[PDB]
Amino acid sequence: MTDPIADFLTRLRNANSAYHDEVTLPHSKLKANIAEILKREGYISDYRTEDARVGKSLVVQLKYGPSRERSIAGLRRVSKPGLRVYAKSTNLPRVLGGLGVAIISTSSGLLTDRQAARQGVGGEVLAYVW
Amino acid sequence: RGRRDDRGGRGRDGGDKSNYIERVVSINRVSKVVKGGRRFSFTALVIVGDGKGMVGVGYGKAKEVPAAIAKGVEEARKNFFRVPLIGSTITHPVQGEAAAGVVMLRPASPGTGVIAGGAARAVLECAGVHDILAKSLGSDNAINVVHATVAALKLLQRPEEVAARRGLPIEDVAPAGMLKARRESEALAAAAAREGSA
Amino acid sequence: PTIQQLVRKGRRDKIAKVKTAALKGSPQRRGVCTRVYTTTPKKPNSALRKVARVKLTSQVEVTAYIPGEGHNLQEHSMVLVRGGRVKDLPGVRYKIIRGSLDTQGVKNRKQARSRYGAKKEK
Amino acid sequence: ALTAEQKKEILGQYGLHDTDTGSPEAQVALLTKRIQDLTEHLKVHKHDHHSRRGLLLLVGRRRRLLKYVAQVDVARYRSLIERLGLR
RNA sequence: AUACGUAGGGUCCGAGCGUUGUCCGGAAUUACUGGGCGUAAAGAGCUCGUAGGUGGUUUGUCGCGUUGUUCGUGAAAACUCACAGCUUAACUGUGGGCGUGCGGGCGAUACGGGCAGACUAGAGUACUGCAGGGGAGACUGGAAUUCCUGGUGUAGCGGUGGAAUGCGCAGAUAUCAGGAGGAACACCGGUGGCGAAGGCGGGUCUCUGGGCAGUAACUGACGCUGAGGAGCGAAAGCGUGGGGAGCGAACAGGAUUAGAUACCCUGGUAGUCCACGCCGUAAACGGUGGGUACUAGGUGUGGGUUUCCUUGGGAUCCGUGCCGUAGCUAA
């Protein structure tokens, strides 16, 4: 065991791809905020955290429209261990040419491409979903 | 594809609507080993399209080159396909595959031009593209390259799709960048419609 | 592939695959020709092609072809060897320029008229 | 093997306190005494060639816990080191 | 012969026009951008672990990494933008951007990381049983073979497609009994287990290996990988001393055959077995490195425990097959 957030994203990818309408997860604050912003922009339905094995657990509902179709298009951690990634205010990448959204853990907290561009600080980007 | 320019006293030549640009990429001779002999047939890959953009792909396995061409044309008529774009650009860079063939596509500055390989040039210009950038790799072939072209094209959609998926509108979905590009596209379309109205 | 292992080592190209070996990548060398005996080309290309072995000034002993129909070079000649690629012959990757140091241009060559040392017809 | 009674008395002896089986010193003592046991089983089964792997695995686990003993507090590390006479 | 050579006749370029030499890209043909390792190139024979990388949940600190900011800063030409001129152009001048940097001050505390820690899910220890061909060591067995011993008892036996090598006729084959020898354990003996892998099976005894299962009892991140390095590691072969019943290389006769050296027979030396050693290579392969989190099933099948009928059925965790979802593969 080396990487928890990559396993977070891998479980999201498999669970959404394998047509499951929910996924369960240990609640470390990192993935908590990742799914929080995910529902904030609406690629998932709704996340709720309750009590579990010694920590807590976050349960995520994936947003499916009129059919079994996922608002999520895909997930991929970029700033992985061994290849951790930093970015600045100017060259803030635009997800899917700007269509999608990203995660950038700013010194001021957590922000996406557009938010950080409106503000202008950088330092650590993460996965992006479109 | 021999002696196609004919002017006779017969009835007609089968002209119809759908003033579609046609293209054929390649035909390889196909050898069936009958007991002690070789029968030779043809395999045509036909790509039909419109300057509006909508595309069709057909595949005629016929022992005759004109029969193969006709079979490909009618399969493309059966197997059509639609592509969304932005003026003369692509809505977003994409990658497509056919089992060994990889194709990368990217929007370009207006008027840049369709810079694409021989097969890709055909598969693209049959659509409504005028200015995008693209390339391909792998498969050391053309059938898979053509097949992957449509695979990449399939990953194309309007910003409305991500707007509905997010529930949130454009902006994050379609930022000013594309916003102004699609505004130019639709404004040119509206101006053309107004001009054609009179 | 193990980014850290890349930091440890890696990322070198395969092989130069050198072509010219006269010396210095010379656009041409000059030397003494010998062994101008004609040998056989490949069986499908049944013919006989006139060649020679030249010791160039580069102190290497290479094999040069004699293009054209007629030849002027003989033993102890100041032949100017250029690089070439003759897939018709085994191990022959050189030519000798006509209308040059030693070998007179090919007689009455008119389709090329620049190669084969064929000067302008008056 | 580590007989259910000798391991218990060893845990009482060198363990941090009662019921604290699995504490680093406790496991160190247990595996150390197991290693001492196998020391002569190998010397009589000179060609066992099969229990030596478990010997090495337990030795490695002992060291992998010794490092954790040292990092938390060098004092307890030295205490156990001169208690068991290691090196 | 529109491919050669020759003529027109055409293509194009032009004081040029082609040839050679070299570099970049095309090449993704080193795949950071932007590659792979079952069958195409590619998982060492297998273990542990130094260096190294590498990290669980959570509290506060530091702001090194990292980012934000001000300034010094990065010669001119560079190169470009813009202006002017050189008859135009080439060319030059002018000013910008540019010079992506480094350095200094100032900031941020999301993250890594450092410090102080803390927690038990990770890991590791206990309790209680489960499978045993896991190994080693010491003891024993007789089948059976051959030889040897006493018989009875024959001219045949074995040999092969047939033969003839070989022997008997002295008693061979055989039959019975006995003794000697050396080696291995048929049946159980199989997706069934065990073992890191090579490997494991007659029985007993001793020591020992590891795994799985239910209680957190406990430690309190003690995790993983792992270059160097470490040993183990099929068979053969050689060193040292024995064994040898048989087999048996090598080497012997006979036999098909043109040739036998080969297939076949007629024997047997080292080896084959043991003891202590050497070596390290096998097609030492799931041809699939170690480890970890997710993705329809179904069905054989080893160990366990529980839960549900009256053994019956379920669940669960671990081993072990096949088919089949998604998805993947060039197939």
PDB file of C-alpha atoms in Angstrom, chain B residues 52-167:
ATOM      1  CA  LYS B  52     -22.036  20.609 -43.333  1.00  0.00           C
ATOM      2  CA  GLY B  53     -20.094  17.877 -41.571  1.00  0.00           C
ATOM      3  CA  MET B  54     -22.100  14.665 -41.365  1.00  0.00           C
ATOM      4  CA  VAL B  55     -20.111  11.588 -42.379  1.00  0.00           C
ATOM      5  CA  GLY B  56     -20.703   8.002 -43.440  1.00  0.00           C
ATOM      6  CA  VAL B  57     -18.385   5.010 -43.690  1.00  0.00           C
ATOM      7  CA  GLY B  58     -18.892   1.969 -45.901  1.00  0.00           C
ATOM      8  CA  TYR B  59     -16.966  -1.168 -46.718  1.00  0.00           C
ATOM      9  CA  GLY B  60     -17.481  -3.011 -49.992  1.00  0.00           C
ATOM     10  CA  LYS B  61     -15.996  -6.511 -50.197  1.00  0.00           C
ATOM     11  CA  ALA B  62     -16.698  -7.149 -53.870  1.00  0.00           C
ATOM     12  CA  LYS B  63     -14.743  -9.012 -56.537  1.00  0.00           C
ATOM     13  CA  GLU B  64     -15.315  -5.984 -58.806  1.00  0.00           C
ATOM     14  CA  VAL B  65     -13.865  -2.530 -58.140  1.00  0.00           C
ATOM     15  CA  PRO B  66     -17.071  -0.694 -59.183  1.00  0.00           C
ATOM     16  CA  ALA B  67     -19.191  -3.149 -57.209  1.00  0.00           C
ATOM     17  CA  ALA B  68     -16.875  -2.682 -54.227  1.00  0.00           C
ATOM     18  CA  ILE B  69     -17.167   1.098 -54.578  1.00  0.00           C
ATOM     19  CA  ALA B  70     -20.957   0.937 -54.813  1.00  0.00           C
ATOM     20  CA  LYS B  71     -21.166  -1.401 -51.817  1.00  0.00           C
ATOM     21  CA  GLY B  72     -18.989   0.947 -49.787  1.00  0.00           C
ATOM     22  CA  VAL B  73     -21.084   3.936 -50.853  1.00  0.00           C
ATOM     23  CA  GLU B  74     -24.346   2.268 -49.887  1.00  0.00           C
ATOM     24  CA  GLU B  75     -22.926   1.009 -46.587  1.00  0.00           C
ATOM     25  CA  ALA B  76     -21.790   4.553 -45.814  1.00  0.00           C
ATOM     26  CA  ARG B  77     -25.346   5.588 -46.642  1.00  0.00           C
ATOM     27  CA  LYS B  78     -26.454   2.888 -44.201  1.00  0.00           C
ATOM     28  CA  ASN B  79     -23.647   3.630 -41.723  1.00  0.00           C
ATOM     29  CA  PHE B  80     -23.739   7.414 -41.357  1.00  0.00           C
ATOM     30  CA  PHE B  81     -22.262   9.482 -38.525  1.00  0.00           C
ATOM     31  CA  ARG B  82     -22.598  13.048 -37.247  1.00  0.00           C
ATOM     32  CA  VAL B  83     -19.872  15.326 -35.885  1.00  0.00           C
ATOM     33  CA  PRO B  84     -20.160  18.539 -33.830  1.00  0.00           C
ATOM     34  CA  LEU B  85     -17.530  21.246 -34.293  1.00  0.00           C
ATOM     35  CA  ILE B  86     -16.929  24.981 -33.894  1.00  0.00           C
ATOM     36  CA  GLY B  87     -16.916  26.948 -37.152  1.00  0.00           C
ATOM     37  CA  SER B  88     -13.813  25.573 -38.826  1.00  0.00           C
ATOM     38  CA  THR B  89     -12.188  24.052 -35.729  1.00  0.00           C
ATOM     39  CA  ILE B  90     -12.829  21.156 -33.376  1.00  0.00           C
ATOM     40  CA  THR B  91     -14.712  21.704 -30.137  1.00  0.00           C
ATOM     41  CA  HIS B  92     -11.962  20.054 -28.087  1.00  0.00           C
ATOM     42  CA  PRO B  93      -8.805  17.976 -28.627  1.00  0.00           C
ATOM     43  CA  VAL B  94      -9.526  14.252 -28.739  1.00  0.00           C
ATOM     44  CA  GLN B  95      -7.835  10.894 -29.287  1.00  0.00           C
ATOM     45  CA  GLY B  96      -9.324   7.895 -31.076  1.00  0.00           C
ATOM     46  CA  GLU B  97      -8.236   4.315 -31.690  1.00  0.00           C
ATOM     47  CA  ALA B  98      -8.828   1.297 -33.900  1.00  0.00           C
ATOM     48  CA  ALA B  99      -6.990  -1.544 -32.165  1.00  0.00           C
ATOM     49  CA  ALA B 100      -3.574  -0.333 -33.289  1.00  0.00           C
ATOM     50  CA  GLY B 101      -4.298   2.983 -34.952  1.00  0.00           C
ATOM     51  CA  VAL B 102      -4.163   6.162 -32.853  1.00  0.00           C
ATOM     52  CA  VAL B 103      -5.392   9.574 -34.012  1.00  0.00           C
ATOM     53  CA  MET B 104      -4.975  12.896 -32.198  1.00  0.00           C
ATOM     54  CA  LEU B 105      -7.161  15.889 -33.069  1.00  0.00           C
ATOM     55  CA  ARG B 106      -6.869  19.507 -31.948  1.00  0.00           C
ATOM     56  CA  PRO B 107      -8.515  22.874 -32.673  1.00  0.00           C
ATOM     57  CA  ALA B 108      -6.470  25.429 -34.569  1.00  0.00           C
ATOM     58  CA  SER B 109      -6.555  29.155 -35.178  1.00  0.00           C
ATOM     59  CA  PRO B 110      -9.227  30.158 -37.721  1.00  0.00           C
ATOM     60  CA  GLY B 111      -7.927  29.657 -41.237  1.00  0.00           C
ATOM     61  CA  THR B 112      -5.034  27.420 -40.168  1.00  0.00           C
ATOM     62  CA  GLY B 113      -6.160  24.614 -42.465  1.00  0.00           C
ATOM     63  CA  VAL B 114      -6.705  20.868 -42.257  1.00  0.00           C
ATOM     64  CA  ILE B 115      -3.189  19.559 -41.634  1.00  0.00           C
ATOM     65  CA  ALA B 116      -3.704  15.804 -41.710  1.00  0.00           C
ATOM     66  CA  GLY B 117      -2.328  12.661 -43.279  1.00  0.00           C
ATOM     67  CA  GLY B 118      -3.514  11.310 -46.592  1.00  0.00           C
ATOM     68  CA  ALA B 119      -6.265   9.113 -45.175  1.00  0.00           C
ATOM     69  CA  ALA B 120      -7.101  11.551 -42.386  1.00  0.00           C
ATOM     70  CA  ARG B 121      -7.263  14.447 -44.846  1.00  0.00           C
ATOM     71  CA  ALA B 122     -10.016  12.621 -46.717  1.00  0.00           C
ATOM     72  CA  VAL B 123     -11.914  11.434 -43.642  1.00  0.00           C
ATOM     73  CA  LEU B 124     -11.858  14.995 -42.307  1.00  0.00           C
ATOM     74  CA  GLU B 125     -12.483  17.199 -45.334  1.00  0.00           C
ATOM     75  CA  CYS B 126     -15.523  15.095 -46.215  1.00  0.00           C
ATOM     76  CA  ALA B 127     -16.962  16.635 -43.051  1.00  0.00           C
ATOM     77  CA  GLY B 128     -17.295  20.363 -42.393  1.00  0.00           C
ATOM     78  CA  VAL B 129     -13.711  20.817 -41.229  1.00  0.00           C
ATOM     79  CA  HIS B 130     -11.624  23.558 -42.793  1.00  0.00           C
ATOM     80  CA  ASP B 131      -9.073  24.371 -40.064  1.00  0.00           C
ATOM     81  CA  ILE B 132      -8.006  21.818 -37.452  1.00  0.00           C
ATOM     82  CA  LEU B 133      -4.751  20.075 -36.595  1.00  0.00           C
ATOM     83  CA  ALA B 134      -4.431  16.308 -36.431  1.00  0.00           C
ATOM     84  CA  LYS B 135      -2.010  13.420 -36.697  1.00  0.00           C
ATOM     85  CA  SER B 136      -1.867   9.650 -36.319  1.00  0.00           C
ATOM     86  CA  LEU B 137       0.475   6.933 -35.098  1.00  0.00           C
ATOM     87  CA  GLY B 138       0.733   3.163 -34.942  1.00  0.00           C
ATOM     88  CA  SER B 139      -0.928   0.285 -36.785  1.00  0.00           C
ATOM     89  CA  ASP B 140       1.386   0.818 -39.790  1.00  0.00           C
ATOM     90  CA  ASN B 141      -1.834   0.641 -41.825  1.00  0.00           C
ATOM     91  CA  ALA B 142      -4.741   2.607 -43.287  1.00  0.00           C
ATOM     92  CA  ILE B 143      -7.949   0.636 -42.652  1.00  0.00           C
ATOM     93  CA  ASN B 144      -7.425   0.882 -38.903  1.00  0.00           C
ATOM     94  CA  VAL B 145      -6.401   4.526 -39.298  1.00  0.00           C
ATOM     95  CA  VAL B 146      -9.657   5.325 -41.100  1.00  0.00           C
ATOM     96  CA  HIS B 147     -11.602   3.326 -38.523  1.00  0.00           C
ATOM     97  CA  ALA B 148      -9.926   5.229 -35.665  1.00  0.00           C
ATOM     98  CA  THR B 149     -10.744   8.544 -37.344  1.00  0.00           C
ATOM     99  CA  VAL B 150     -14.453   8.009 -36.712  1.00  0.00           C
ATOM    100  CA  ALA B 151     -13.594   6.679 -33.245  1.00  0.00           C
ATOM    101  CA  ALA B 152     -11.968  10.002 -32.375  1.00  0.00           C
ATOM    102  CA  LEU B 153     -14.787  11.947 -34.038  1.00  0.00           C
ATOM    103  CA  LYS B 154     -17.331  10.133 -31.868  1.00  0.00           C
ATOM    104  CA  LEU B 155     -15.864  11.716 -28.720  1.00  0.00           C
ATOM    105  CA  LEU B 156     -17.136  15.102 -29.923  1.00  0.00           C
ATOM    106  CA  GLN B 157     -20.090  16.854 -28.322  1.00  0.00           C
ATOM    107  CA  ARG B 158     -21.521  20.291 -27.690  1.00  0.00           C
ATOM    108  CA  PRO B 159     -20.929  22.117 -24.395  1.00  0.00           C
ATOM    109  CA  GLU B 160     -24.618  21.409 -23.723  1.00  0.00           C
ATOM    110  CA  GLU B 161     -23.697  17.807 -22.873  1.00  0.00           C
ATOM    111  CA  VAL B 162     -21.314  18.703 -20.051  1.00  0.00           C
ATOM    112  CA  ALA B 163     -23.682  21.495 -19.009  1.00  0.00           C
ATOM    113  CA  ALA B 164     -26.473  18.961 -18.480  1.00  0.00           C
ATOM    114  CA  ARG B 165     -24.129  16.429 -16.866  1.00  0.00           C
ATOM    115  CA  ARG B 166     -22.888  19.018 -14.369  1.00  0.00           C
ATOM    116  CA  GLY B 167     -26.330  20.564 -14.147  1.00  0.00           C
TER     117      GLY B 167
END
